[PDB]
Design an enzyme around this catalytic site. Structure first.
Site, PDB file in Angstrom:
ATOM      1  CG  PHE A  69       3.006   0.379  -7.668  1.00 11.31           C
ATOM      2  CD1 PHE A  69       1.831   0.786  -8.216  1.00 11.31           C
ATOM      3  CD2 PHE A  69       2.965  -0.548  -6.641  1.00 11.31           C
ATOM      4  CE1 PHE A  69       0.633   0.114  -7.925  1.00 11.31           C
ATOM      5  CE2 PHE A  69       1.789  -1.189  -6.321  1.00 11.31           C
ATOM      6  CZ  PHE A  69       0.630  -0.887  -6.979  1.00 11.31           C
ATOM      7  NE  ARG A  97       3.787   9.248  -3.104  1.00 15.06           N
ATOM      8  CZ  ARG A  97       2.883   8.531  -2.471  1.00 15.06           C
ATOM      9  NH1 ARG A  97       2.352   7.487  -3.061  1.00 15.06           N
ATOM     10  NH2 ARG A  97       2.499   8.846  -1.250  1.00 15.06           N
TER      11      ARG A  97
END
Ligand SMILES: NNC(=O)c1ccc(N)c(N)c1
Length: 165
Positions: free
Chosen positions: A113, A55
């Site tokens: 992330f 993502r």
């Protein structure tokens, strides 16, 4: 005593792009830093090598580390399936911050992330444990293969990874 450093060699549809290195804040979040370090070296028999950034949202973050389901629903830590939020000493101050993804309190696994913007609303919710040290240019290049909804236009992979120094 010295915070360890890890590296990811990134590929785009199998073609080498470059290397991103990270300083892990073991002085401030040792248990979280150690999990990422060990997943990066693969010394427990599983880890990030070969996984993808599933993502990527430009102007937000690139997320990866799901080596069991390859889509944001999996992953596991070196301590078991999940582990606790260690502390929230460090904040999401801007691009380059490395932080743990989760599914609610005390559910850290392997997913992580890299911030590409300041994500202050995440403070006290996601554990920050590192920062990009070299190759923010490579993160920016990666970022260009994302989209508003996070789906990537080419497959962004960690072709290799490990520990520096
Ligand atoms: N939040 N969505 C998930 O399925 C998920 C997201 C992050 C994780 N670390 C785990 N284990 C699961």
């Amino acid at each position: 005593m010295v915070n360890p450093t890890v590296f990811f060699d990134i590929a785009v549809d199998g073609e080498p792009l470059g290397r991103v290195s990270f300083e892990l804040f073991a002085d401030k979040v040792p248990k979280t830093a150690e999990n990422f370090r060990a997943l990066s070296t693969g010394e427990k028999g599983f880890g990030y090598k070969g996984s993808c950034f599933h993502r990527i949202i430009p102007g937000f973050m690139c997320q990866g580390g799901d080596f069991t389901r390859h889509n944001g629903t999996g992953g596991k830590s070196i301590y078991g399936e999940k582990f606790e939020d260690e502390n929230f000493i460090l904040k999401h101050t801007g691009p380059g911050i490395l932080s743990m993804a989760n599914a609610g309190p005390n559910t850290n696994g392997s997913q992580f992330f890299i911030c590409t913007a300041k994500t202050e609303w995440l403070d006290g919710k996601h554990v920050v444990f590192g920062k990009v040290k070299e190759g923010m240019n490579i993160v920016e290049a990666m970022e260009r293969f994302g989209s508003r909804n996070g789906k990537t236009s080419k497959k962004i992979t960690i072709a290799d990874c490990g520990q520096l120094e």
